[PDB]
Amino acid sequence: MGDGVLELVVRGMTCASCVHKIESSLTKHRGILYCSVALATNKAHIKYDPEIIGPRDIIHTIESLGFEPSLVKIE
Ligand SMILES: [Cu+]
């Protein structure tokens, strides 16, 4: 219970192809309520249910796509 959002700076992902790579690849794992990623600040925000899946798992998941994630939550 209780939602959550976290932003990770995803170094490597930096064109529309990479955007849709992350976004589409994310929108399938349980926990993910909403993804979106933006290249302007090379950020990915994953609105994951902060219970069943953790920042670790998101890190590994994004790493599997070939871009380096590190949690920040800027805004
Ligand atoms: Cu790209």
Swiss-Prot record:
Disease entry from the Swiss-Prot or TrEMBL record = Menkes disease: An X-linked recessive disorder of copper metabolism characterized by generalized copper deficiency. MNKD results in progressive neurodegeneration and connective-tissue disturbances: focal cerebral and cerebellar degeneration, early growth retardation, peculiar hair, hypopigmentation, cutis laxa, vascular complications and death in early childhood. The clinical features result from the dysfunction of several copper-dependent enzymes. A mild form of the disease has been described, in which cerebellar ataxia and moderate developmental delay predominate.
Q: Where does this one sit in the cell?
A: Golgi apparatus, trans-Golgi network membrane; Cell membrane; Melanosome membrane; Early endosome membrane
Q: Which organism is it from?
A: Homo sapiens (Human)
Give the family from UniProt.
Answer: Belongs to the cation transport ATPase (P-type) (TC 3.A.3) family. Type IB subfamily.
**Role according to the record:** ATP-driven copper (Cu(+)) ion pump that plays an important role in intracellular copper ion homeostasis. Within a catalytic cycle, acquires Cu(+) ion from donor protein on the cytoplasmic side of the membrane and delivers it to acceptor protein on the lumenal side. The transfer of Cu(+) ion across the membrane is coupled to ATP hydrolysis and is associated with a transient phosphorylation that shifts the pump conformation from inward-facing to outward-facing state.
- Which gene carries the instructions for this protein? ATP7A
Domain of life the protein comes from? Eukaryota
Portion held of the full protein: 562 to 633 of 1500
Q: Where is the HMA domain?
A: 4-70
Lineage start: Eukaryota, Metazoa, Chordata, Craniata, Vertebrata
Domain remark text: The nucleotide-binding domain consists of a twisted six-stranded antiparallel beta-sheet flanked by two pairs of alpha-helices, forming a hydrophobic pocket that interacts with the adenine ring of ATP.
Q: What is the protein's given name?
A: Copper-transporting ATPase 1
